[PDB]
Automatic annotation (TrEMBL), chain A:
The chain holds residues 57 to 147 of 1397 of the full protein. It is found in: Nucleus. It comes from the Eukaryota. Residues 5-83 form the AP2-coincident C-terminal domain. This is AP2 domain transcription factor AP2-I, putative. It comes from Plasmodium vivax (malaria parasite P. vivax).
Amino acid sequence: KLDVPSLVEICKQQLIVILKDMCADSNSSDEKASFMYHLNRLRSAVTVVDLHNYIAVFGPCLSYNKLPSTWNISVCDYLKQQLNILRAADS
Amino acid sequence: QDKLDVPSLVEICKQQLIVILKDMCADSNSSDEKASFMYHLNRLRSAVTVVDLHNYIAVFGPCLSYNKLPSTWNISVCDYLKQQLNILRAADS
């Protein structure tokens, strides 16, 4: 129940790194606003519950410790990675 | 009041998820991936409420929302993750 502060902070910082890696190669003024939205959302997070959805989206990046712009893998293979993470839980 | 929704929505979303899962894992023919396919099929069959397949919705959000199949969409991982970020933002606003 009581999640550890350090784990929350490492996860939050890794999520910020991955978000910056994603929205680095992007220069539209609406995508700037979306990147700022998600970055502020990550910065304001205080519990694992706040980060839950971002962890869900970036699971196979946090695991394997990859960055999306440098990870040469197809979209289908990424969804299969996520299905494997799905199967790992509930065990 | 939030009761009659759940059966119909879980049924429709299930159908879409079977379509997507068949697209991904039914074509190939390795042993342990047959096992994983069977696993996910039984998992979908046993799902009863929205919270049971919340995780599958999370994984395949952009696929269901835009009627796309993973083997045919042909977009990068980064663009798919941006699509998921957009679904994310839409959830709160």
